[PDB]
Design an enzyme around this catalytic site. Sequence first.
Site, PDB file in Angstrom:
ATOM      1  CG  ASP A  35      -2.058   0.971   1.278  1.00  0.00           C
ATOM      2  OD1 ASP A  35      -1.850   1.892   0.528  1.00  0.00           O
ATOM      3  OD2 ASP A  35      -2.372   1.065   2.393  1.00  0.00           O
ATOM      4  CB  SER A 199      -1.388  14.141 -13.525  1.00  0.00           C
ATOM      5  OG  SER A 199      -1.695  13.986 -14.905  1.00  0.00           O
TER       6      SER A 199
HETATM    7  O1  LIG Z   1      -7.722   6.070   3.296  1.00  0.00           O
HETATM    8  C1  LIG Z   1      -6.587   6.054   2.781  1.00  0.00           C
HETATM    9  C2  LIG Z   1      -5.570   6.623   3.900  1.00  0.00           C
HETATM   10  C3  LIG Z   1      -5.429   5.896   5.007  1.00  0.00           C
HETATM   11  C4  LIG Z   1      -4.823   6.701   6.013  1.00  0.00           C
HETATM   12  C5  LIG Z   1      -3.474   7.331   5.785  1.00  0.00           C
HETATM   13  C6  LIG Z   1      -2.645   7.167   7.051  1.00  0.00           C
HETATM   14  C7  LIG Z   1      -3.527   6.383   8.023  1.00  0.00           C
HETATM   15  C8  LIG Z   1      -4.446   5.547   7.132  1.00  0.00           C
HETATM   16  N1  LIG Z   1      -6.166   5.434   1.725  1.00  0.00           N
HETATM   17  C9  LIG Z   1      -7.068   4.929   0.631  1.00  0.00           C
HETATM   18  C10 LIG Z   1      -6.612   3.463   0.317  1.00  0.00           C
HETATM   19  N2  LIG Z   1      -5.437   3.346   0.128  1.00  0.00           N
HETATM   20  C11 LIG Z   1      -4.484   4.051   1.448  1.00  0.00           C
HETATM   21  C12 LIG Z   1      -4.622   5.626   1.222  1.00  0.00           C
END
Ligand SMILES: O=C(CCC1CCCC1)N1CCNCC1
EC number: 3.4.23.22
Length: 330
Positions: A35, A199
Amino acid sequence: STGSATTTPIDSLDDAYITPVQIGTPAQTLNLDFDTGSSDLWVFSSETTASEVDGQTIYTPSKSTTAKLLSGATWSISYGDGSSSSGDVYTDTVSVGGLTVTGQAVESAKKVSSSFTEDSTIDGLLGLAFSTLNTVSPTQQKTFFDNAKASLDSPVFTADLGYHAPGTYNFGFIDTTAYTGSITYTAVSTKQGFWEWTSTGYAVGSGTFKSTSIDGIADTGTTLLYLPATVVSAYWAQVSGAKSSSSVGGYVFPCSATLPSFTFGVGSARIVIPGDYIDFGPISTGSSSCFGGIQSSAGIGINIFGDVALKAAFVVFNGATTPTLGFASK
Ligand SMILES: O=C(CCC1CCCC1)N1CCNCC1
Ligand SMILES: O=C(CCC1CCCC1)N1CCNCC1
């Protein structure tokens, strides 16, 4: 050092990709969702509430001779889709594709939300955004990439996701055989902790390119491409019968359609997403309405270049002192 691991779609739609990760001694292999939009490495474990585990492989720290409780440390994350997980923390040896980090924080889930339980193919997440977003308290922890960085031949990792096919995550080197032409690098802001870039514009199908700045995050954790409502409307206007459905929660289109490509700018370069990449299939089994792979970012607060966009490119996540992103066609 370097590492190289294959990443595999979890299903026929490329809804998510899993990559095998070795944790502990002897190794316990878990399939994690890498991720680039978050910064926690968390796993289903022997501590996860039993009713919240349905088919995942679990990490059992008591079976690892290298596992240590990180005393007092807890974590809790809430994602944009409403899902969540939380727990406590161990340090352990973690290896990805032959690259080993000792002392990595492994966040053991005590609780996971229903979306995680229901996905039997994903044993946890491995975060690759900047360590400033790590949720461990009271002592924030580093990502696998940040812990590996000093040991790597080059302070980089690359994402080469497949369309309906496996792909590769490499650490510490850029496979010059994995892309065509040249890599175009673009500036990254770390101010929000994401791999955030701008972008230079877009085109729909064979249409003219529209020069316009679009700020967003390169997020391997995100399935779809989320862009401003103007851009998304312009795309779906080229598909007969496409519409935004409040009942389904985004743009849908007739499954009989042939979708146009979508081009996004990276500096003076262009990445073309083939139309087939934008088809996420029937909204429900047997439906003739199909879910679109380009959706509005209105109500997110940020544009997300998720897997639909990233899988059209070879992507370099350059973690040098001044980070940059690179994109190449492939
Ligand atoms: O909602 C988020 C961020 C999550 C938070 C960022 C820091 C703590 C968790 N996305 C979408 C899906 N992929 C990851 C990024
Ligand atoms: O793509 C998403 C949700 C995207 C949301 C968009 C805005 C906030 C996050 N996934 C990946 C697969 N697992 C479930 C979550």
